[model samples]
Target: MKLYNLKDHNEQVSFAQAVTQGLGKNQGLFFPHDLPEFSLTEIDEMLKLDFVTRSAKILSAFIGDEIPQEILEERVRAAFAFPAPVANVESDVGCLELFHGPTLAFKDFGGRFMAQMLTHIAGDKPVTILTATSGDTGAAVAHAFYGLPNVKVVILYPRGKISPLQEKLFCTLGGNIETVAIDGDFDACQALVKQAFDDEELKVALGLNSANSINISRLLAQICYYFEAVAQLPQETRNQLVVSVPSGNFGDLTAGLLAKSLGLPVKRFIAATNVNDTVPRFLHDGQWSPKATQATLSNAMDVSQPNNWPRVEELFRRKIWQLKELGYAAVDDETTQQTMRELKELGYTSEPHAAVAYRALRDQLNPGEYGLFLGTAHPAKFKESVEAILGETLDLPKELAERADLPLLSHNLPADFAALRKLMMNHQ
Candidate 1:
């Protein structure tokens, strides 16, 4: 399978090339030339298969021989040892719990999978994986790549913006994983990483690669959970199911669209965003405008311009009408707070990201329509906000509770690309 830049459809590269290049020379994210297709019968048969088995089948088509079958299966099995279950939260509205992995966030699935794939592809050569995280992506990448040979991960996160738990997760993993707190927002950090990949001097010194969803490996891994969610629904209910995704970078939602393209039985997709609603605005006005990311309770979804929006545009062949057919909704702070309270009343604690998507799903509910909101993070990750709204502290799982006492350690850097280049060059 070949991946091409959304800006120029004819500019294509292989899976390994896309992973190594990070971003196209034209500064566009690589998108698959053709989406993989599967029949409903084939999807149904996958329900009986294990998570990794099912993932290998769906992702192999995209990855091809970049990773051999035996190694790919091993990687999938190791990465997906836990369940990514979909549970009914209310009538016709289910919560796809993607925070069941080690990092307790949806990003764990993609981050872990990418690390393993990189380990296989890099062989003995040292590789520098540069990533910018709003919240969860930093920790997920750190944990996934922590002791892997010839792999070093440098994560840049907005200082004072991410939650305490997020900071701890990024800092505690001390092996080859290094954390940098950027002076600006998530967008600024992301821009620095992109710039470093394009700089010839920095590129040679750092061996720059991305763990973001811009990588085909990360995107392909994200597609697995969508298949896992769809397989759980009964045939009668599957056709009418509208999946609401809590989109930030838009990678998760776009992966679902890729699944739909592959004949997954999904009715519609709701792209849910918080105050950082660039995609929502683009969907409504047909204008692509990115602003400085506003700080929000849903810190992870606080991207001003999502890197994967181009992938969505590319998939639709840059047609606005085609994007409109797939639904879009933007949730604000007030509504997100209310939804958090409502979810607690209904006996489920929701993180800020989940609350945003939950509110969007509730607003769109019709008499007979069904929807599933992608709960991208655990409530424990946003203890302060969840406690204030619900009037009680969340009971975190044992794994998460253990992380509370760990000390955070990170270097603070300016938003400029030059500072980032200096840090990468001098990084041990």
Candidate 2:
């Protein structure tokens, strides 16, 4: 598939190039030049197939002939080895559980797929993946690329921002995956990554790529699951289906927009967010102001300036008002905790982020509209908050428990570009 830099219409590259380059000139994101469209009937027919087969079919639209179809299917099957089951949370509301993967988060779908694609493309060529994560993405990206031949992953995450379990899950794996606990916020870590990508000398020497959603491959893999979520619902609910995504960097929501553009029967989308409600405010007042990142119970959704807002705007033809079908809700930490308790009382255990999505879905779903919110992570991952909210001792999944006991292996770093450059160059 051909993709063009959002900042430059004349410059285009293949899907493989987009994956490897991470960012185009002037820090522009790569977007598909043309998206394959399917008729609603064709989509309905495609949904009948199982997840992996249909995922390959859905992904092949954006991937085109970049990778062989059989190989793509094999990679998709391997990456999505777990299920994203849709379970009824209420009479007209459901939750699509997306935490059944290795890292216990929705990002597993994208991270694992990117790892496979990179492995296939970069035979013996060495590549370094540099990424910044607020919480879940660090573990997902690190685990995805860990110990892969000729690949090294360096993750930057905010110190004391992510959950302890979230830190240990990836930070304890010492070899090949190096975790940097930066002394600033996630935005600072993200800025350092962009600066690294912008530095031509360092970029070339490190063979730098990114596992963040800035790379189109992450969004492409994410698009498949929206279709899978719709497929799991009853046929009658498909037409009125509404999905709420707990958004931070906006990659997952951007993928959903792509799915809708491909003729998925979703009626609307609710961009669920924590107090870091940049998108919500943008949708409301038509201003693009983002304040300093605030710590929240939904730590993963605590992004102030979402990187994928450009992609979202590009999809809407740069018309902010064209998002008539997109709803917005910004739940604070207190409300998120209250909703988590409510869900627990309703026989549904939810972490803070999923609670934000659920709260938004509850506010948006009309009488006849069936809503499904993305359950972005496992509750066990947020042990402290979840246990406090639910007032019950939550047992960690055996794998998570094992990881929690492992010693943390991470580097402490200041959030300076020069410092980051020195470290990257020293690694080489």
Candidate 3:
């Protein structure tokens, strides 16, 4: 099972190579040449297995023997020890809780899994896990690779774009992790990281890989939770399943589609999003144009230029008309806020990002059909906003509140490739 860069379909690499390269030489994200389908028997047994075991089996199908089986399984165990629970929110809609990890966001699944995999593959050699984050990705990556002996993480997030608590969560972890607040938008920071990946000098000087959704490992790990969510469904409703995702980089939504490609019984997916609705607009008008990202209550989904939309297009081989079953909607700030307040009234609490997904589900769901929106973060992560809308402050788990007060150790940097390269050299 080898992966090919979308730009140069002829060139291929193994799972390890696809992940370690971060971005391919042709500047395209890596994708597997083939998506294997699961047999009914295998699917039945997978449904019976626990989350970690099922994850190992599902991932091994794509991973093959690229990494040792024992090491891969162990990494899966470490990553999924904290499971993403599927909570029934209504008769037809459910919430796939994905923020139970240390950073209280969905990115933790990808970050922790990628960190452990990188650790096993990179023995004594030092490697730099460089990534750009809109919000929670940085915090999750920082916490995932915090004290790994062979790994140093440099996370660049748009300054004042992420929630204040998110800053403290990642920035305060100072040992092997460093967070940089860039005086620019998410697209700018993302571009700088992509530019750094192309600099042969930096690649040679420091072994640089990414923890962002750009990395195949992160995407592969993300697919596991979709399977877990479906497994918990009443068997009768499995085939009637409609999954929705609150997307920014489109990685999480892409992972859901990938699960369907591998033969999950999903009806289709909803591209639930905030104002950064480039994909939604494309789906609507058939014109692919990306605008500047606008900041909102859902800052994590504040990505006007999602880097992974191409991957989604590639999955359909560019025949989008054949894929109308793929749902698309862009929830505005007012709508997202209203959804959060309404959910609170119903005795359910969700962060603004998850509110977008929930809103999409409510808008598009049929009365009799089952739907699950990916709850991308813990409501505790957005304490101020959640409280403001609810007119009351809820008690945060001791785990989250303790970290909220940590002294942040982040550095502010220009959104420049050369500046980042210098920091990489100095840090190494």
- How accurate locally, in lDDT, is each candidate? 0.82, 0.89, 0.85
Q: State TM-scores per candidate.
A: 0.96, 0.98, 0.97
Query: After TM-score superposition, what is the CA distance of residue 62 in candidate 1 from its true location, in Å?
Result: 1.5
lDDT of 1 by residue, 129-231 (tens): 9998999988888888888778889999999999988888777766697889999999888888887767877777768788888788888888889889877
The CA-based lDDT of model 2 is what? 0.89
lDDT agreement of model 3 with the native: 0.85
As for TM-score, the candidate ahead, 1 or 3, is: 3
Where does candidate 3 have its weakest 10-residue lDDT segment?
Answer: 316-325
Tens-place lDDT per residue, model 2, 1-428, is: 99999999889999989888998988889998997789878898989999999998888877888887888999999899998898889999999999999999999999999988887777758999999999888889998988787888899999999889999898999888888999988988888887788899888898998999988889899998898998888889988998999999899999999998888877889999999988899889888899999988888887898989889989888333387568999999889889999999899999999999999999889988999999999999999889999999999997589888889988889988888788877775
Model 2 alpha-carbon drift over 4 Å, by segment:
318-321
In the range 194-217, model 3's lDDT, one tens digit per residue, is: 888788888877888888999998
Best candidate (score: TM-score): 2
Task: Give the least accurate 10-residue stretch of model 1, judged by summed lDDT.
Answer: 315-324
Q: Which candidate is the best by lDDT?
A: 2
